[PDB]
Amino acid sequence: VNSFSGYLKLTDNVYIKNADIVEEAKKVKPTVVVNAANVYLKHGGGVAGALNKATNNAMQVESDDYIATNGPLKVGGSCVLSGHNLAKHCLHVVGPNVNKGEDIQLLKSAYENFNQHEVLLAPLLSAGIFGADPIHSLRVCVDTVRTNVYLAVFDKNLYDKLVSSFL
Ligand SMILES: O=C(O)Cc1ccc(CNC(=O)c2ccnc3ccsc23)cc1
């Protein structure tokens, strides 16, 4: 038993809710919240900008030190950093950005990072401003992630569409 509430169960291990991932993280304080990161960990907008804003920019300060030491992530890759006031840890995962021409097949590689964590609160990778089809992203999630994932979908209209079209 865990503390996530109000989720619809899609499969053995995937759950979904219409929620703002920032407020969901603030209440649950999960072990892992996933950020929709880019390779530079520049958290300017979308999920990343909202998560970073909720940390009062501490996420960005930590991220800048990470990049200065390690260089950029790979598309499809990830790193574990602090969750600040939102979670124990933040798993920064880089899905392909269709608005940058990145290969959508890298979406499966991105979701594989979730398997290193037993339970996660996460957004749909490559959705929103990353320009992928959220329905495809949900399918890849279900077919790739084997650990327990609680998906937060900010847009109520989108949430209803993902549920109604789920196979
Ligand atoms: O919700 C988030 O977590 C981030 C986010 C993703 C997408 C949109 C735009 N809406 C849609 O793409 C959309 C809305 C309703 N039906 C469909 C069907 C195929 S796409 C689609 C806004 C926010």
Curated annotation (Swiss-Prot):
Effect of residue 31 to A: In strain: Mu/B.1.621
Impact reported for residue 164 to L: In strain: Gamma/P.1
Record comment: activity regulation: Inhibited in vitro by GRL-0617.
Catalytic reaction annotation: Thiol-dependent hydrolysis of ester, thioester, amide, peptide and isopeptide bonds formed by the C-terminal Gly of ubiquitin (a 76-residue protein attached to proteins as an intracellular targeting signal)
Domain Macro: residue ranges: 1-167
Membrane topology: Multi-pass membrane protein
Taxonomy, superkingdom: Viruses
Subcellular location: Host endoplasmic reticulum membrane
Subunit structure: May form homohexamers. Interacts with N protein.
Its biological purpose: Responsible for the cleavages located at the N-terminus of the replicase polyprotein. Participates together with nsp4 in the assembly of virally-induced cytoplasmic double-membrane vesicles necessary for viral replication. Antagonizes innate immune induction of type I interferon by blocking the phosphorylation, dimerization and subsequent nuclear translocation of host IRF3. Also prevents host NF-kappa-B signaling. In addition, PL-PRO possesses a deubiquitinating/deISGylating activity and processes both 'Lys-48'- and 'Lys-63'-linked polyubiquitin chains from cellular substrates.
Name recorded for this polypeptide: Papain-like protease nsp3
The species this protein was found in: Severe acute respiratory syndrome coronavirus 2
